[PDB]
């Protein structure tokens, strides 16, 4: 029920002349938008990515992002000139903005910035501020950025008003894709280990909440290890479970919302 909307921006500055900015947008774990450096326009990656916004509303929202990217590129380049020779290229900025939707028609917004892979700056309330751990020289860039009242007013409007209003639109428009149920397929295998290591591969399930356990009849095997959730291309999830002998008797059981109650047990 709690969806987190994310605008992820990644910008690379190789030298004084070379630069690149690419963005991607996620509603939960489904990609909604993409904005390559090559493109002048933000792209839709779902039929419902525009949400409940009108065409005139979207264009107005896109225009300010277009102006933003150009301005962002120049502002960093000027800040490098301002900090030289204490900081120099190559430079990587990562930006993470959006809001988390909650029950009872409420939300909470965020804007987080990372420098050279480390979180340094957030937008909080009415101004930019540095987080604990950040180097002290950032006080000057932040001072200069906070001087820009218009940028501050816009970011406030985006985080407080525009983002939550937009996401509620997406949730209404993309209900079928967001509430989609995909059945997992399970297959078993073995590889030699430092006893043999039985592997239970589970693939093609949505949503992400899954339950995978090795079981000797009713007894749930304690030595079961869950791996990492790995993505598929067709927007489904992959996961493997391992148990560290005597294999005749135990089975990989999988619970999921898609199966409609009836779990699948797969015997060795």
């Amino acid at each position, epitope marked *: 029920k709690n969806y987190t909307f994310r605008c992820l921006q990644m910008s690379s500055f190789a030298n004084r002349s070379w630069s690149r900015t690419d963005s991607v947008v996620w509603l939960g774990d489904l990609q909604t938008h993409r904005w390559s450096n090559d493109s002048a326009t933000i792209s839709f990656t779902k039929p419902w990515s525009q949400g409940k916004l009108s065409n005139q509303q979207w264009e107005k929202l896109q225009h300010m992002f277009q102006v933003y990217r150009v301005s962002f590129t120049r502002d960093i380049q000027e800040l490098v000139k301002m900090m030289s020779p204490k900081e120099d290229y190559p430079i990587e900025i990562q930006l993470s903005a959006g809001c988390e939707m909650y029950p009872g028609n409420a939300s909470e917004s965020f804007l987080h910035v990372a420098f050279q892979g480390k979180y340094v700056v957030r937008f909080w309330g009415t101004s930019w501020q540095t987080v604990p751990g950040a180097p002290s020289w950032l006080d000057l860039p932040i001072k200069v950025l906070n*001087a820009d009242q218009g940028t501050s007013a816009t970011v406030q409007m985006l985080l407080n008003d525009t983002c939550p209003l937009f996401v509620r639109g997406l949730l209404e428009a993309g209900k079928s894709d967001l509430e989609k149920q995909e059945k997992p397929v399970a297959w078993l295998s073995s590889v030699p280990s430092s006893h043999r290591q039985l592997v239970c591969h589970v693939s093609g399930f949505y949503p992400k909440p899954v339950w995978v356990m090795w079981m000797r009849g009713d007894q749930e095997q304690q030595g079961t290890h869950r791996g990492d959730f790995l993505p598929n291309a067709d927007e489904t999830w992959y996961l493997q479970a391992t148990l560290d002998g005597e294999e005749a008797g135990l089975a990989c059981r999988v619970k999921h919302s898609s199966l409609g109650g009836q779990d699948i047990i797969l015997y060795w």
Partner: T-cell receptor, first 111, second 113 residues
Framework: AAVTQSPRNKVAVTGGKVTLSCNQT?????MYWYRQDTGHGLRLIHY???????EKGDIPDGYKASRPSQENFSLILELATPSQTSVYFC??????????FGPGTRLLVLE | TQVEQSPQSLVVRQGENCVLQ??????????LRWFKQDTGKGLVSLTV?????DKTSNGRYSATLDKDAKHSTLHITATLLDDTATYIC?????????????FGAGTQLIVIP
């Protein structure tokens, strides 16, 4: 919030060194050198984000810039040419957008 | 250029009003400033407009700004001899020190007493 310039008015010859100075006691980090010519807006030559650093403006050729301290920003014409006969304005500012302009300096380069 | 002023020059009689235009293509356009410059003199700030649809007043001077139209006007009410000067439109592309000012070539005003 005053910005001073010296000299106010200068006559120089082709090939000589010509140094135009600018001074502000406003503790402003940022200083900018412009030139004004008829039928043109003011055009940025050089600017400085702080002591011991200069950055190229839109029309930097022929000029070198020096920021010895917070207070002073200098425009240095090593080999002065007639094409540098102009009015030169200096300006300073803090983190805000306002640039505070000096009185202007009139340079004329004769053969 | 990115900042264009109109007319190039004009001559008015004492006590007549006049309107000076500014048109620009500057992106972004944070604020717009009108300067008065006497012959052989420096730059005196008359007003600075800031909003999307803005209007300002400074005695006999008043100015409008329309950011959608990227357009500004300077009205001088009941002109005097002292108004004989060049009037300069300037667009700043940021609301901070990171910005660059974009200057118009100016409009010459001559008032006949």
């Amino acid at each position: 919030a005053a910005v001073t310039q010296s000299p106010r008015n200068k006559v120089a010859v082709t090939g000589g060194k010509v140094t135009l100075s600018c001074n502000q006691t406003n503790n402003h980090n940022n200083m900018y050198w412009y030139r004004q010519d008829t039928g043109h807006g003011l055009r940025l030559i050089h600017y400085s984000y702080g002591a011991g650093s200069t950055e190229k403006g839109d029309i930097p050729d022929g000029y070198k810039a020096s920021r010895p301290s917070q207070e002073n920003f200098s425009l240095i014409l090593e080999l002065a040419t007639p094409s540098q006969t102009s009015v030169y304005f200096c300006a300073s500012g803090d983190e805000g957008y306002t640039q505070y302009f000096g009185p202007g300096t009139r340079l004329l380069v004769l053969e | 250029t990115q900042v264009e002023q109109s007319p190039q020059s004009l001559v008015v009689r004492q006590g007549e009003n006049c309107v000076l235009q500014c048109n620009y293509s500057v992106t972004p356009d944070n604020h717009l400033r009108w300067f008065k410059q006497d012959t052989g003199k420096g730059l005196v700030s008359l007003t600075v407009l800031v909003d999307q649809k803005d209007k300002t007043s400074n005695g006999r001077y008043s100015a409008t700004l329309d950011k959608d139209a990227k357009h500004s006007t300077l009205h001088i009410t009941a002109t005097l001899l002292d108004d004989t000067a060049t009037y300069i439109c300037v667009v700043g592309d940021r609301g901070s020190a990171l910005g660059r000012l974009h200057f118009g070539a100016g409009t010459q005003l001559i008032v006949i007493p």
